[PDB]
């Protein structure tokens with residue numbers, strides 16, 4: 001049997017606060033038809049504004065990944081998108097009551113839980129994958145983001161903070177999803193910030209919802225969160241989580257390998273844009289027989 005498209009089985013609702021806006025927001029996930037993709041909609045507005053979660057709709061990428069359509073935005077999509085990608089959700093409406101996805105606990109754990117509580121529905125259409133055929137790379141200064149051909153899905157990341165909390169950590173991790181669970185090993189990795197960068201945002205009337213309840217706060221010498229880390233390598237795992245989410249703006253699951261080096265949302269989106277434009281570097285494929293596939297998905 002083919003690998004089929006997936007949507008949600010039921011509607012589910014969550015509440016939280018926008019990391020940047022500090023505004024309380026209601027999120028509603030709904031099933032969608034085949035070939036819809038993930039579509040955001042601002043149900044607080046009249047008319048209601050829909051923004052497909054695609055690379056073409058990305059605006060600002062300086063702090064988080066924002067979607068735009070004229071003067072309407074949806075901020076901070078990446079951790080929700082990471083959860084959709086990690087569970088292989090093809091088709092969904094994401095309704096928001098305000099301009100930002102709720103931060104929840106700073107990770108993708110609450111979203112992965114919410115989605116699986118709703119349950120998944122296989123649909124009668126072949127799931128489309130984007131397969132990397134040729135290496136594609138973007139760089140700026142010492143930052144690099146790369147796609148390499150690979151029969152599977154694997155994401156590697158390296159960070160380099162010249163900082164007391166990070167010295168003598170390897171600062172590198174690789175996850176290969178043939179053997180390793182997005183839920184168990186990536187989903188819980190919380191966002192993080194250094195104190196001087198946080199203070200800068202607050203001075204600009206940003207990061208207004210942020211706190212030790214939804215982020216790892218690192219002062220000049222120490223993590224401030226009294227209860228410690230979820231993973232020895234939570235920082236680099238969060239970078240992988242963000243990459244997975246940013247990558248999902250392609251609109252289809254990837255067959256290939258991503259490697260990031262001190263990269264973030266801006267270079268992640270540049271990599272997508274360069275990939276898309278280089279049509280020799282990728283193809284859309286389906287699997288009529290799941291046994292020939294380099295990726296598999298958990299039961300719905």
Ligand SMILES: CC(C)(N)[C@H](N[C@@H]1CCc2cc(C#Cc3ccc(Cn4ccnc4CO)cc3)ccc21)C(=O)NO
Nearest residue numbers: 063064078191192193198202207210211212215217242
């Ligand atoms: C790629 C990353 C890891 N750079 C990125 N990081 C996000 C970006 C914005 C942000 C803001 C905060 C905060 C925050 C915050 C703000 C205020 C306080 C407490 N506070 C209140 C007043 N002054 C202070 C400073 O102590 C604590 C944390 C944390 C994390 C992040 C990412 O994951 N993108 O997907």
Ligand SMILES: [Cl-]
Nearest residue numbers: 263264266267
């Ligand atoms: Cl970047």
Ligand SMILES: [Zn+2]
Nearest residue numbers: 198199202203
């Ligand atoms: Zn402050």
Ligand SMILES: [Zn+2]
Nearest residue numbers: 078191238242
């Ligand atoms: Zn993040």
